[PDB]
Design an enzyme around this catalytic site. Structure first.
Site, PDB file in Angstrom:
ATOM      1  N   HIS A   1      -8.042   5.265 -22.267  1.00  8.16           N
ATOM      2  CA  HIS A   1      -9.349   5.193 -21.625  1.00  8.16           C
ATOM      3  C   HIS A   1      -9.224   5.005 -20.109  1.00  8.16           C
ATOM      4  O   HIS A   1      -9.957   5.614 -19.340  1.00  8.16           O
ATOM      5  CB  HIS A   1     -10.207   4.121 -22.287  1.00  8.16           C
TER       6      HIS A   1
ATOM      7  N   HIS B   1     -11.801  -7.530 -13.822  1.00  9.38           N
ATOM      8  CA  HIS B   1     -10.770  -8.420 -13.295  1.00  9.38           C
ATOM      9  C   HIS B   1     -11.388  -9.519 -12.448  1.00  9.38           C
ATOM     10  O   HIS B   1     -10.747 -10.534 -12.218  1.00  9.38           O
ATOM     11  CB  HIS B   1      -9.753  -7.661 -12.444  1.00  9.38           C
TER      12      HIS B   1
ATOM     13  N   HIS C   1      -1.788   5.089   3.304  1.00  7.42           N
ATOM     14  CA  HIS C   1      -1.380   5.302   4.691  1.00  7.42           C
ATOM     15  C   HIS C   1      -2.451   6.177   5.353  1.00  7.42           C
ATOM     16  O   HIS C   1      -2.948   7.122   4.747  1.00  7.42           O
ATOM     17  CB  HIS C   1      -0.024   6.015   4.735  1.00  7.42           C
TER      18      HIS C   1
ATOM     19  N   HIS D   1     -16.566   2.211 -26.317  1.00  5.71           N
ATOM     20  CA  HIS D   1     -16.104   1.774 -24.999  1.00  5.71           C
ATOM     21  C   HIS D   1     -16.461   0.303 -24.810  1.00  5.71           C
ATOM     22  O   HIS D   1     -17.092  -0.305 -25.685  1.00  5.71           O
ATOM     23  CB  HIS D   1     -16.730   2.619 -23.883  1.00  5.71           C
TER      24      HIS D   1
ATOM     25  N   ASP E   1     -13.811  -4.445 -18.838  1.00  6.76           N
ATOM     26  CA  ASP E   1     -12.966  -5.583 -18.484  1.00  6.76           C
ATOM     27  C   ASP E   1     -13.099  -5.673 -16.966  1.00  6.76           C
ATOM     28  O   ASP E   1     -12.644  -4.774 -16.242  1.00  6.76           O
ATOM     29  CB  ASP E   1     -11.519  -5.257 -18.904  1.00  6.76           C
TER      30      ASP E   1
ATOM     31  N   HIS F   1       1.648   7.429   0.405  1.00  2.97           N
ATOM     32  CA  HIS F   1       2.847   7.818   1.179  1.00  2.97           C
ATOM     33  C   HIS F   1       4.151   7.948   0.373  1.00  2.97           C
ATOM     34  O   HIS F   1       5.264   7.924   0.933  1.00  2.97           O
ATOM     35  CB  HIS F   1       3.059   6.958   2.448  1.00  2.97           C
TER      36      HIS F   1
ATOM     37  N   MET G   1     -11.692   5.790 -16.654  1.00  4.02           N
ATOM     38  CA  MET G   1     -12.638   4.676 -16.817  1.00  4.02           C
ATOM     39  C   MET G   1     -12.235   3.430 -16.025  1.00  4.02           C
ATOM     40  O   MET G   1     -11.798   2.418 -16.605  1.00  4.02           O
ATOM     41  CB  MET G   1     -12.864   4.334 -18.296  1.00  4.02           C
TER      42      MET G   1
ATOM     43  N   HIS H   1     -12.378  -1.920 -15.666  1.00  8.94           N
ATOM     44  CA  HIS H   1     -11.974  -0.758 -16.453  1.00  8.94           C
ATOM     45  C   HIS H   1     -12.326  -0.898 -17.916  1.00  8.94           C
ATOM     46  O   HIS H   1     -12.523  -2.004 -18.415  1.00  8.94           O
ATOM     47  CB  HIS H   1     -10.467  -0.438 -16.301  1.00  8.94           C
ATOM     48  N   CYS H   2     -12.380   0.235 -18.603  1.00 14.58           N
ATOM     49  CA  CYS H   2     -12.584   0.223 -20.050  1.00 14.58           C
ATOM     50  C   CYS H   2     -11.292  -0.248 -20.724  1.00 14.58           C
ATOM     51  O   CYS H   2     -10.186  -0.004 -20.209  1.00 14.58           O
ATOM     52  CB  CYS H   2     -13.016   1.613 -20.535  1.00 14.58           C
TER      53      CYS H   2
ATOM     54  N   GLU I   1       1.437   0.157   8.772  1.00  7.99           N
ATOM     55  CA  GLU I   1       1.568   1.616   8.702  1.00  7.99           C
ATOM     56  C   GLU I   1       1.190   2.077   7.273  1.00  7.99           C
ATOM     57  O   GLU I   1       0.414   3.022   7.086  1.00  7.99           O
ATOM     58  CB  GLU I   1       2.980   2.070   9.114  1.00  7.99           C
ATOM     59  N   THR I   2       1.714   1.361   6.282  1.00 11.64           N
ATOM     60  CA  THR I   2       1.542   1.697   4.872  1.00 11.64           C
ATOM     61  C   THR I   2       1.418   0.386   4.118  1.00 11.64           C
ATOM     62  O   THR I   2       2.172  -0.565   4.386  1.00 11.64           O
ATOM     63  CB  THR I   2       2.763   2.528   4.377  1.00 11.64           C
TER      64      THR I   2
HETATM   65 CU   LIG Z   1     -13.655   3.685 -22.758  1.00 11.45          CU
HETATM   66 CU   LIG Z   2      -7.013  -4.736 -16.409  1.00 13.35          CU
HETATM   67 CU   LIG Z   3       4.094   9.335   7.494  1.00 12.80          CU
END
Ligand SMILES: [Cu+2]
Ligand SMILES: [Cu+2]
Ligand SMILES: [Cu+2]
Ligand SMILES: [Cu+2]
Ligand SMILES: [Cu+2]
Ligand SMILES: [Cu+2]
Ligand SMILES: [Zn+2]
Ligand SMILES: [Zn+2]
Ligand SMILES: [Zn+2]
Lengths: 333, 333, 333
Positions: B137, B92, B247, B87, B90, B298, B142, B127-128, B271-272
């Site tokens: 992964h 961001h 939502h 493993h 990363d 939603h 992950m 994330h892995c 709303e969303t």
């Molecule tokens: Cu992994």
């Molecule tokens: Cu990424």
């Molecule tokens: Cu709705």
């Protein structure tokens, strides 16, 4: 428009963009371009799958055309007699006549010349749109970007100047390649013969491949994009048919216009942005670390399994303040 | 970075987030974290379907790490000998070396320590990403969120202060569980044995399940989120692989950073909202009515059929000005 | 709320929107509406495929309700004894009680009256949400838009006034019509009989059809939308279940609130915008060229193959400055 000086622009093949100015002292011009349509069978993956493709200027995507806000784009579209199908062009950057499609219907052996006023700044999709076969022409490769720069260049949310030192153009193509009873992809003798089977795959809404610039791995190895630490790159990303979510691994979108329209303030510090199917967007990033970056669609299946990923090879000096391996992999104490 | 005070943070299991300050008078620190990878079979639905899962710290999502802009994140990543796979991680939120993946490659029985400068405010996916098995992964569990708060706390579009009284973290996971000839979901003896069948489901781009925090109903019943009228909640929503559209039923996003980056003005009254696959976003809401709310994706199929929905149980006094049943259900006159 | 004047609004069928003021000198009112639910079999395509549909007021989408920020919406929801199913309503524009669903549960032969304060400006989805059958009621047609205008009308990013001369409402419906062993779409004698087969199609997440306003071609031919050069149109686009990406071919979104909430600055010059599943958005465009425009979902498969496209017929004088055919199609020299 008829009072203005004309200029003649020579287009270049993606991922490059033709030489141009950002901020300029030049007044409006009629900027003249020519593109020639080429239908052709292309190999789109590592296993030799083919696509009966259709292109502007022989490439997927078509070349990027660059003008300034207030300029007039004047395009000669050529459809050689060696092609099988009619074509045209719809500029999202243009006003009227279905983006110019109604005025550019060219049979093999014909050409036409369209002029329109590029009165809105931004990156805009252009694509083929022949009546009754619009999605097929688009998904087979007939799209690209028109970039209309503001006359005084790019600006941040506070109105301060922004610039790029290097521009790259990436077209992302959702492909719909049919399979036969044996589960193998079909190879078609002619463009016309691919049509019916392709529509059937299209209607499932599941691409068989999703590729940058016409092929799995197009922007990798010898063909990786390049930059150096301290250089600012513009990454233009077009997707004429389907949503995508660009991400630079180990980097960011420093300033991003994900809807692609430069009169709007950009957003900063993005990890991943969103290009709506039927649009082009633009991200600026200034490199701070050397190394090989991946630039990809962050649906990681779409990237790693289906082909939506490229590389950027960056020269320069490593920065320990930004990142440092404190302890390398070693046995657990 | 070497001049700075170090601090040691104890992580907590989702949906909670570890105690932290928003606006702070503290200068930059090296903030130290540790996470231990655990591969394990998890039951993911009401019918007993299993996933051969991979986790940071035993949970889906991994725990949320919280620092301030200008801090340095210093992570020790541990991969116990009881695991089967290599493993890494990363971030961001980080700059360089594929987000730290290239510097954190840990085989079972190994560990590593990464430091990076959290120089950009926002919620960011981590994330892995092991070379050649990245999507597997990630979709197996992950991922998590790093939240980098601005040193002076959250701000509205006009630069006025915003705050939350309570923070929750929701990781949404598109799962790709294979089926056998009988149409039943497959149960795998080991992680390695699930691989080939899973890739095949992945390539269809159709999840079998889409779940919050590892399981259908994870955030319901005894495990519903909680709040009271007058309290402001931060809902962090991460989706490391696929788009989602959060939502709050009967509520709103009062202030939302859907791209998740705090230096940008938030949008109000949503709303969303939209979380791009490969990102984390953040919404503030101040409760005004008591009752049981649903917080969901939603696309209502993805929510109700596939599992992307939770509940928030809210204490307090009902407000008739905001909403009133004027006439209850009764026969049509 | 009990101190306020009441007003009574007569609803109109989509794509029209009932007469209303934008900026107004009127103080807050209790605005009274009535809607009657109608379940019915509808023909949804050119080949005679049917949908066992469910509607507010007999149409897909339901009618658009228009009020001002600070008004109270007071809805009488009627469920006639001729219907088979229970129903209710969830207003995304409302605060509390699952948007009003918990307070509006109406069996066939019953009605109810809900009041809520429309305290947030924007276009908001309303939809049916009966416990345990939420997605089915929504995808079968039970949604529409509440528009809450700011009391002083629409504003641009700088706070300058914006207006529309004509408003249209478009509801986009992802449909999930089952097929029998022969590959033909199934025709169901009753609503209840369509249920199980439909859920199965729903869970694939692949619509069989995606239509504006209830049918392939609903907004074409005799039923095309209309405008003239110099007129500003508001295009309200609702999608209660799935993402879409509206585009006006040969036009733009002059000012667009894609998340649909008017207290946020709109974006300008959009080629294509994004409506999140579970929301309504709003675009202004002022026509500059006459002709027949297409307004469509710019996933062109979803548009041309699946049905998500309409037309707008625009009267007026052509503008050669904006666009000119310099040379018509003619043989290549
Ligand atoms: Cu992994
Ligand atoms: Cu990424
Ligand atoms: Cu709705
Ligand atoms: Cu073409
Ligand atoms: Cu288009
Ligand atoms: Cu209903
Ligand atoms: Zn530079
Ligand atoms: Zn508070
Ligand atoms: Zn007007």
């Amino acid at each position: 428009a008829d009072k203005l000086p004309h200029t003649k622009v020579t287009l270049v093949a993606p991922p490059q963009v033709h030489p141009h100015e950002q901020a300029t002292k030049s007044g409006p011009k009629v900027v003249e371009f020519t593109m020639t349509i080429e239908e052709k069978k292309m190999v789109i993956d590592d296993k030799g799958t083919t696509l009966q493709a259709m292109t502007f200027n022989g490439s997927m995507p078509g070349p990027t055309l660059v003008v300034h806000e207030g300029d007039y784009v004047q395009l000669t579209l050529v459809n050689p007699a060696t092609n099988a199908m009619p074509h045209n062009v719809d500029f999202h950057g243009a006003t009227g006549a279905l983006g110019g499609a109604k005025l550019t219907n060219v049979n093999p052996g014909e050409q036409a010349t369209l002029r329109f006023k590029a009165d809105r700044s931004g990156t805009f999709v252009y694509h083929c749109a022949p009546e009754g076969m619009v999605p097929w022409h688009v998904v087979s490769g007939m799209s690209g970007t028109l970039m209309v720069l503001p006359r005084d260049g790019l600006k941040d949310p506070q109105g301060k100047p922004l610039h790029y030192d290097r521009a790259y153009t990436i077209g992302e193509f959702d492909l719909y390649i049919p399979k036969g009873p044996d589960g193998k992809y079909k190879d078609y003798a002619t463009l016309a013969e691919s049509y019916g089977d392709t529509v059937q795959v299209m209607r499932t809404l599941t691409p068989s491949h999703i590729v940058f610039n016409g092929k799995v791995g197009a922007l990798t190895g010898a063909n990786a994009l390049t930059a150096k630490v301290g250089e600012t790159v513009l990454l233009i990303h077009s997707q004429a048919n389907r949503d995508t979510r660009p991400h630079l691994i180990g980097g960011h979108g420093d300033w991003v216009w994900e809807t692609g329209k430069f009169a709007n303030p950009p957003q900063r510090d993005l990890e991943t942005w969103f290009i709506r199917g039927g649009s082009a967007g633009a991200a600026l990033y200034t490199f701070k670390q050397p190394g090989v970056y991946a630039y990809l669609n962050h649906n990681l299946i779409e990237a790693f399994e289906l082909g939506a990923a490229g590389h950027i090879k960056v020269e320069g000096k490593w920065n320990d303040d930004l990142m440092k391996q404190i302890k390398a992999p070693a046995p657990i104490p």
